[PDB]
Symmetry: D2
Subunit: 179 residues, 4 copies
């Protein structure tokens, strides 16, 4: 089974989490794991002015999402929604939606946040979009049951472990369903 870890990160927190998720998924025999990012939308000028951490993972196209059996989406908490960069990217998946290309595939979500709250709303409002595509949504249950998070007022050891678990669990389901 093919697993995509698809993420947006500005300051590196989701980037760090995405590596942990990918590690977990890679523990599963038969899981082929790939990590990609959505494009930065800010001109580099503005990204640099804001102190961004330049991302170097391969950039995904909206259309290639169809190639995977499971997609694990990472986004920072942005006032209780996904980031504009992730939203912009998902707004470019209309062609896939019309063709049913993501229908029935596994989806799961992880996030990063400060200490102000909103991470639960970020995850569940991301689920909404996944459901429009007919994706099967995988929470982690029993920190939120909705998906792995990291809270920064670098991620903690325990936070990285939960992220690894999420990858391992989702990848295991993907192999169960697709070999």
């Amino acid at each position: 089974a093919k697993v995509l870890v698809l993420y947006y990160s500005m300051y590196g927190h989701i980037e760090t989490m995405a590596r942990a998720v990918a590690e977990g998924a890679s523990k599963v025999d038969g899981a082929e794991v790939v990590v990609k990012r959505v494009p930065e939308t800010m001109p580099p000028q503005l990204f640099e002015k804001a102190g961004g951490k330049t991302q170097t993972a391969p950039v995904a196209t909206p259309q290639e999402l169809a190639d995977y059996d499971a997609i694990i989406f990472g986004t920072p908490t942005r006032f209780g929604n996904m980031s504009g960069q992730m939203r912009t990217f998902l707004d470019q998946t209309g062609g896939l939606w019309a063709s049913g290309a993501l229908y029935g595939k596994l989806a799961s979500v992880f996030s990063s946040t400060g200490t102000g709250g909103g991470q639960e709303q970020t995850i569940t409002s991301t689920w909404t979009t996944l459901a429009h595509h007919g994706m099967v949504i995988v929470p982690i249950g029993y920190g939120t049951p909705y998906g792995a998070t990291t809270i920064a007022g670098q991620p903690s050891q325990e936070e990285l472990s939960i992220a690894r678990y999420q990858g391992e669990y989702v990848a295991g389901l993907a192999v169960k369903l697709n070999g």
Copy 2:
């Protein structure tokens, strides 16, 4: 695989939908399907005063939910939440939550509503509870992509067909995962 269609109905709309969901699930070879209701919480006096349709399906206990591979939950839209009767029942699943008894099992939701809106919020706020139990959430994608609905300002032919589809689709996933 064992599929439970678990519902609350006051005036029969969810009851009718639950039969359709069960029909769909029963199309899947290897799916063993059961329909049960959550208890009415209103004293019969008050239920009758309100013009309720007495339900006669077997009553589920909170604890027996653990016996199934997939649970498809039906609730009317009650100001954009599940009904108090379904909420009360789910508030009695703390023992299952502590034991991880529903973890990883399939869940899906259908609803009934008037013409005032709220059915999307009812379904997605029901998903929240399912996620606390670690259940895998199955939307229907492409009326809402979140789950089958019926809108009454008896369910329509098309509404019953979508309900049948939801049962068939979820039951198929349950057999794929559990034989």
Copy 3:
């Protein structure tokens, strides 16, 4: 203006929070504050055996919600929703809904959790019902620090942690935010209604 603090509590955490909300609201001259609880639905024997806490607040009826200018709802987090007791009570407000009785009145929400997870969803899914009634929804955001009566203090409503074992009580930091929520909502109620 009349302000109702309407709550459900099993083990007393929301009860303590509700008293703090009412204390804050009472600071506003011209705000008449009342605290009431929704009925317990569990049989007394089962409630007692579960370690439930008996409470002195009067029990509200659904009908009387119409009598207030602002209602501040408290509920524990129950798998990311309000409790069955609060949901059952709100399901009895159909008559108020049909007559527009709560339309335009202020609403705000506070909660409690064992270990944190689901509090955001409890508050926002309670807002949904308030919106069906046409109520104006008051989040707390992150208020100016000097407005809290405890120094060094979610944006959706005040919360408190009960612990996995339920034995933790609300801290003065948590209660300060609850008091602010009451004072803030009551101030708005007086601004709008005298």
Copy 4:
């Protein structure tokens, strides 16, 4: 009181709704209403090739949101969220957030869909962000029928159906609800701010 109708529109449906919201708001004496759009993020060539509609409304900056007493946000439904363009714009309001610039101001939301699905989620997930800013959230509920300027007319905010092909335009019934939303919010803004 100053009221901003701030919107994003691709194909003009939200634009038409925004004009209706502004018309309603303008009915309130003492409400100064302005309509602005968030920037298009698509390159002009791609936007034009996609059949996008050019629009006369001035483009808002994030900073100027601080200048208003009420902000009514319009966005199409994009898989049950606000659009990427609105999300990108709101992600630029961190400075306002840090200074408390929008705290306590009124907010309300309207939307549009192709075939209905997701509109509720678009509105309520927009409310989340408004709550982080401490804004007071105004749902429309089901208002008294005589307050709509079209007879025989979700509770979360006004909506319109664009059709699967995008060719449907807002009906007078839909626009009447949008006009009501503007008038209602503007009335509240004047009540609170003069």
